[PDB]
């Protein structure tokens, strides 16, 4: 009867509890290996030979301090395949050089590809527009830029974020100290997008929950709604009046409201990705030249920006010795910047 | 026929005003206008402020060599502390400008104004016959602003430690706060970060699910937004279609069947997150700092094996020894 | 179609095979840690193996294509 491809397409697109689809073949093994490798790294694999750190439960770390640490700086931008010239098939040496981070990173890249393809496939089979995959392009941009394009522009994989909690905090403070990323305007747009998306989520939830129609006699109003009803469950006119006379402007179009909720975080993530891509090559908004000139010509001239520059110097100088152990930075106590030193 | 006070109350509580005033607006409008006026004029043209109290003023206005990013209204002097410093408590106006009095004026008026904004949101919810819990949602950013503007100065004993009214000043506040309290390792700040990230995630998710399942009501040569008419009775998107898509995306009860419960969750997640991070800053005002995992791993002998928390501690030490230059004459920062 | 939860939790085989398999996995993990097999498999140092007598510093790998030999030199003894 049917061809083999048609039978495989019928089985993959079966309406079961966990949809597989054609995207599932790429998604499920890659995501499974990413999560499994992260648990394996945070559970057993050390960071003693790459960072001189303990980042596993086997070494005594908790959930915050355990991480899948990035490879060593000497590895460069190697793919760090298990069969590659660095490990040469030795699983122990592959774990010791940080190859598990590359395992997780590559499998997570292809797992994000698989999940976006899953969104496309389910939207096509269900019959709706694929705006969820466009929304998920945001986190894909974040992961690509930060975990791939930033280290690929830097010396090695060593300066990529390590898959942990305190490791991510280290990445935050390291990027602030060596890059002044708070001063970067694309990061400012990203912060604006994230905080405005949280604002939109909270305000839309509150407005809908506070402009509902009295569709039941019970004081708890959650049961007064059926998914198959035709009428709206909350008053758009009352909400529009409330926000027109409270804030000055208000949404009148529900569709535009929800596209704005879609757009704000997506734009924030994409602009912050542009900022991180700029940081990848040390093309930074680190300094304002005129402020530095005026501070050099006038010792009494001081702004909060100059204080931030001094704090970045402190971060770099007090962090580089133990944060980049491969460089063998030996900084004496007199070259270390101190507030009392001047 | 009515009394003059009754007519005044009818005008104040009128729903026919373009912007609703209300009794909370009676307190809100002049306080917010005063704060806005002082902030604008002090951001454009204000002399440098001796924030640390060590007679080394910091320039924050545009006319003294600042741009939009580096410009700020500097917090008040550390000599003042959290003493009440209005204009009339200074010997001269320029002495008031030198000690950062404008920061106290703007902060006090702004906090009163945002409390008035909470009350006014309640008031116009009451005048329209709707449920009054949007103000409860707005209490979270008000809580955060209070934590960074008043509570932290109260905990640390000086209005100089409040967040500066600027951008680079805000970054300086964040860096010094991380150096002295390790806010990243504080679980309430982690709950706040989860709140904002989840709020962005859920805002994008809800927007994409609604936009994905819009009911076809327009032609190909016009925007899809015109398929919804302001004030229509029917629903503009297929809730069942979005629910089915999201159920098949993760698993069949990872979605909210109820739109009311879904929107309660939308309004609940980031409000609770911001509440928790604001309370975390309020608790770190009184020096109940975040998790300390420094030197938590030692070898058989007892040599310290560093972790990521130790590198974070190195960064915090780098920020700590450089903040507030020449204001520390003693080893500890008590 | 799908298998309901009541049929899953009321199955007699479902409980006996779990009772004979899952504690075996738990003890297998316990012995994978407690016998020192995890340290040898994943290269994680023992608490007495972070520093040696000759090496009192951080064992950094400084070459890419001779990393296996350098790790064998650093982890010997």
């Amino acid at each position: 009867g049917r061809g083999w491809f048609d039978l495989i397409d019928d089985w993959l697109k079966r309406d079961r509890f966990v949809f597989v689809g054609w995207s599932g073949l790429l998604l499920f093994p890659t995501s499974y290996l990413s999560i499994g490798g992260w648990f394996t790294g945070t559970t057993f694999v050390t960071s003693w030979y790459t960072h001189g750190l303990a980042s596993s439960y086997l070494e005594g770390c908790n959930f915050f301090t355990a991480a899948v640490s990035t490879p060593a700086n000497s590895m460069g931008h190697s793919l760090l395949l298990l069969w590659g010239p660095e490990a040469q098939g030795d699983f122990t040496r592959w774990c010791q050089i940080g190859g598990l981070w590359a395992f997780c990173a590559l499998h997570g890249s292809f797992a994000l590809i698989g999940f976006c393809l899953r969104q496309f496939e389910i939207a096509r089979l269900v019959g709706i527009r694929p705006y969820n995959a466009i929304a998920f392009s945001g986190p894909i941009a974040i992961f690509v830029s930060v975990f791939l394009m930033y280290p690929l522009g830097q010396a090695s994989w060593f300066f990529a974020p390590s898959l942990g909690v305190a490791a991510i905090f280290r990445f935050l403070l390291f990027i602030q100290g060596f890059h002044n990323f708070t001063l970067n305007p694309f990061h400012m747009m990203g912060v604006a997008g994230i905080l405005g998306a949280a604002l939109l989520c909270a305000i839309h939830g509150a407005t809908v929950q506070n402009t509902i129609f009295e569709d039941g006699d019970a004081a708890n109003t959650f049961r007064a709604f059926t998914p198959t009803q035709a009428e709206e469950t909350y008053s758009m006119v009352t909400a529009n009046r409330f926000w027109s006379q409270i804030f000055g402007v208000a949404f009148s179009n529900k569709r535009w409201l929800h596209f704005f909720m879609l757009f704000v975080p997506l734009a924030g993530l994409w602009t912050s990705a542009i900022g991180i891509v700029g940081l990848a090559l040390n093309l930074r908004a680190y300094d304002f030249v005129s402020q530095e000139l005026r501070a050099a010509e006038d010792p009494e001239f001081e702004t909060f920006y100059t204080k931030n520059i001094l704090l970045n110097e402190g971060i770099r100088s007090w962090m580089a010795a133990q944060d980049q152990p491969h460089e063998n930075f030996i900084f004496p106590e007199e070259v270390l910047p101190r507030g009392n030193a001047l | 026929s009515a009394s003059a006070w009754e007519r005044f109350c009818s005008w104040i509580t009128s729903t026919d005003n373009r912007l609703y005033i209300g009794w909370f607006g009676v307190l809100m409008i002049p306080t917010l206008l005063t704060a806005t006026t002082v902030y604008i004029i002090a951001f454009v043209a204000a002399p440098p402020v001796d924030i640390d109290g060590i007679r080394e003023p910091v320039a924050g206005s545009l006319l003294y060599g600042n741009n939009i990013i580096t410009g700020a209204v500097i917090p008040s002097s550390a000599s003042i502390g959290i003493h009440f410093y209005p204009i009339w408590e200074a010997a001269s106006l320029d002495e008031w400008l030198y000690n950062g009095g404008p920061y106290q004026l703007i902060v006090d008026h702004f906090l009163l104004g945002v409390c008035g904004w909470i009350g006014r949101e309640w008031e116009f919810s009451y005048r329209l016959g709707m449920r009054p819990w949007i103000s409860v949602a707005f209490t979270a950013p008000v809580a955060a602003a209070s934590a960074v503007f008043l509570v932290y100065p109260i905990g640390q004993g000086s209005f100089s430690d409040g967040m500066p009214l600027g951008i680079s000043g805000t970054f300086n506040f964040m860096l010094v706060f991380q150096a002295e309290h390790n806010i990243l390792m504080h679980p309430f700040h982690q709950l706040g970060v989860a709140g904002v990230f989840g709020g962005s995630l859920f805002s994008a998710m809800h927007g994409s699910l609604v936009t994905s399942s819009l009911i076809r009501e327009t032609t190909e040569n016009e925007s899809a937004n015109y398929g919804y008419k302001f004030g229509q009775e029917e629903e503009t998107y297929n809730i069942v279609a979005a629910h089915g898509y999201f159920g098949r995306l993760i698993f069949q009860y990872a979605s909210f069947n109820n739109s009311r419960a879904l929107h309660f969750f939308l309004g609940l997640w980031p409000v609770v997150g911001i509440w928790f991070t604001a309370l975390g800053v309020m608790t770190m005002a009184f020096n109940l700092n975040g998790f300390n995992f420094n030197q938590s791993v030692v070898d058989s002998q007892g040599r310290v094996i560093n972790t990521w928390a130790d590198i974070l501690n190195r960064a915090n030490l780098g920020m700590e020894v450089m903040h507030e230059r020449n204001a520390h004459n003693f080893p500890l920062d008590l | 179609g799908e298998r309901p939860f009541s049929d899953i939790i009321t199955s007699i085989r479902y409980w006996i095979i779990h009772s004979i398999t899952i504690p075996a996995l738990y003890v297998a993990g316990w012995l994978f840690v407690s016998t020192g097999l995890a340290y040898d498999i994943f290269g994680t140092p023992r608490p007495n193996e972070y520093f040696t007598q000759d090496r009192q510093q951080v064992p950094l790998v400084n070459d890419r294509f001779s990393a296996k030999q350098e790790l064998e030199d650093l982890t010997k003894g």
Partner: peptide, 30 residues
């Protein structure tokens, strides 16, 4: 025997193995 069985057992056997490993690691004398 279905795909859901395999999807559960992928996230179950190593989950129990890791939970046992972590419970064993809780008793290592630091």
């Amino acid at each position: 025997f279905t795909f859901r069985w395999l999807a559960i057992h992928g996230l179950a056997v190593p989950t129990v193995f890791f939970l046992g490993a972590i419970t064993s690691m809780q008793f290592i004398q630091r």
